[PDB]
């Protein structure tokens, strides 16, 4: 009971992570004008290097899906032929279902990240009682992480240029209606809702 409009990156020489990020940033520029969190992420040909050539925006009622692909970025990037839009096809009844959850537990492993964690643990050691020695906090030793295909986003009301990193793990075709965030998503704190990978 879902619709999906695929957009595919044409011109032979492009960084898909650099462009998919901008598409998600346009989706973040969207839906802080209208109070909704309904639109998907859905990377169909997600490889183990360079998240692939197209991106679809899976959602419900579809009166707010069509409006996202006429935002004068997609139209301007369709005029000069770099994108190619599919005209709102219903999802087929037999599909593979994946969750594109933003982990946010990889930027908490980096040295600047775990220092920030320790420095927050310092600040809430004033739940009184003499506090931890910061010498007894080691950069584990031999960490291993997979796979997370990191995209390059940035904040607007500050000059932080964060980045979000997303993994592909798949499960249990349907639960939710729909919820799942302003960066599309399959993470946001309650809804681990499958997206059906058009």
């Amino acid at each position: 009971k879902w619709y999906y409009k695929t957009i595919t990156f044409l011109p032979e020489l492009c960084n898909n992570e650099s462009l998919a990020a901008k598409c998600l940033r346009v989706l973040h520029g969207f839906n802080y004008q209208y109070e909704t969190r309904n639109i998907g992420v859905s990377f169909p040909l997600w490889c183990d290097a360079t998240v692939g050539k197209k991106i679809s925006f899976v959602s419900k009622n579809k009166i707010e899906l069509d409006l996202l692909l006429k935002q004068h970025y997609f139209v301007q990037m369709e005029q000069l032929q770099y994108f190619h839009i599919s005209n709102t096809v219903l999802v087929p009844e037999d599909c593979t279902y994946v969750s594109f959850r933003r982990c946010q537990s990889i930027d908490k492993l980096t040295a600047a990240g775990l220092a920030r964690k320790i420095r927050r643990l310092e600040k809430r050691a004033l739940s009184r009682g003499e506090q931890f020695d910061p010498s007894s906090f080691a950069q584990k030793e031999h960490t291993a992480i997979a796979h997370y295909h990191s995209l390059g986003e940035s904040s607007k009301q500050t000059n932080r240029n964060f980045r979000l990193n997303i993994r592909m793990l798949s499960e249990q075709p349907r639960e939710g209606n729909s919820i799942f965030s302003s960066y599309g998503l399959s993470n946001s704190e309650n809804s681990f809702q499958p997206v059906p990978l058009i």
Binding site: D48, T110, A112, P134, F137, Q139, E141, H142, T143, A144
Partner: protein
């Protein structure tokens, strides 16, 4: 010339630059680094070595040993070029003494050139070197960014006229020795990037490390700390920067080599002009254009020398 067996032994024997983190409690712990190996879905090991949170400052320790193994060649083969080189050394020692090379070799020990990139985004770094044989205190230096910059700043009363001698009396005297124990205190900012030496990886950023107190610590090379204190050569056709005192004067970062045999300034056009350079050092007066600049390089290359065979 080049008598099919002419090897030398190095005079300057540097050691590994061991890192230590000192705390506000005034106790020293070994610096530790993590290794992020990527695990692509159905080895690429990347290391990161940052200063841990709440650390007072960092201490880098190494021991350098100036010896007298440039007088006699190791294996000469022929006893015609043997007295040539020995005569050329003692004539150089007699005419224009070891003060210049001693100063050039000690200046880039006493300003933290052997840290390479740990001076970058550093508030202050203080060097304390203990010489041997010595009869007094530790020769300690102040903040080396404002104080000690030029040659004249290093030429202060109680810390230059006594440690250039013992290097001059090392290179001159037979079996002469000078063992300097150098300790440098880096005042780095909160979570500052420490850059140690990396392994070869014959085929991304795996660090060179050794075990201290049962845990691995970064090392900053054994040869990456001898190739820093021997960045002297600025006697090549025109002049740009101090290079590594090599045979063909090879620049590393820029891929080309200045002082190349087409120019005829390398350590084969100059070594084969030995018989000329004994004639020039006879009487007055040696010019500082193409004689002293060449003799400096000759001796700077004889200190590093081995092995000259063809």
């Amino acid at each position: 010339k080049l008598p099919t067996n002419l090897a030398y032994e190095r005079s300057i024997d540097p050691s590994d630059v061991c890192f230590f983190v000192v705390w506000p409690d005034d106790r020293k712990t070994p610096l530790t680094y993590n290794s992020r190996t990527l695990l692509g879905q159905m080895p690429h090991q990347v290391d990161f070595c940052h200063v841990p949170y709440g650390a007072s400052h960092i201490e880098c320790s190494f021991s350098v040993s100036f010896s007298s193994e440039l007088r006699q060649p190791y294996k000469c083969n022929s006893s015609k070029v043997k007295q040539t080189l020995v005569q050329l050394v003692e004539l150089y020692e007699t005419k224009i003494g070891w003060t210049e090379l001693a100063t050039r070799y000690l200046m880039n020990i006493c300003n933290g050139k052997w840290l390479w990139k740990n001076t970058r985004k550093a508030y202050c770094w203080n060097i304390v070197l203990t010489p041997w044989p010595w009869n007094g205190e530790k020769v300690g230096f102040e903040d080396i960014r404002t104080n000690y910059t030029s040659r004249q700043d290093f030429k202060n009363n109680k810390n230059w006229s006594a440690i250039v001698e013992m290097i001059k009396t090392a290179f001159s005297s037979t079996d002469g020795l000078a063992i300097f124990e150098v300790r440098a205190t880096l005042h780095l900012p909160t979570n500052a990037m420490v850059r140690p030496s990396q392994v070869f990886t014959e085929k991304s950023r795996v660090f060179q490390s050794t075990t201290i107190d049962g845990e691995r610590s970064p090392i900053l090379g054994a040869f990456k700390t001898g190739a820093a204190i021997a960045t002297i050569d600025d006697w090549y056709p025109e002049a740009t920067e101090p290079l590594r005192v090599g045979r063909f004067g090879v620049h590393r970062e820029d891929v080309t080599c200045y002082r190349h045999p087409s120019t005829g300034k390398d350590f084969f056009s100059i070594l084969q002009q030995a018989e000329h350079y004994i004639e020039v050092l006879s009487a007055n007066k040696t010019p500082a254009q193409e004689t002293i600049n060449d003799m400096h390089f000759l001796m700077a290359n004889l200190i590093k020398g081995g092995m000259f065979q063809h």
